[PDB]
Swiss-Prot record:
Outcome, altering C25A: Abolishes zinc-binding and stability of the CXXC-type zinc finger and causes loss of DNA-binding
Effect of C16A: Abolishes zinc-binding and stability of the CXXC-type zinc finger and causes loss of DNA-binding
Effect in UniProt of substituting K34A: Impairs DNA-binding
Effect of M58A: No effect on DNA-binding
Name of the featured protein: MLL cleavage product N320
Organism of derivation: Homo sapiens (Human)
Amino acid sequence: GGSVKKGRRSRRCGQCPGCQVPEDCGVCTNCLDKPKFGGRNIKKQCCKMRKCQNLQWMPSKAYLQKQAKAVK
Ligand SMILES: [Zn+2]
Ligand SMILES: [Zn+2]
């Protein structure tokens, strides 16, 4: 259930508004959903301000399963 299926490889940049947030903004639905923000840690979702904006993506190869290694 928590595995990649209809998606591709993605890696957050690490220098955007999202990646620069190591804490909970405390004002977005996700954060406010936390007890410390009045919530109840029931929704405990990814902070809207934390979610990366720019990540490295690449086409999937689960359907092709081609080869791209140093065959020898
Ligand atoms: Zn937030
Ligand atoms: Zn980022």
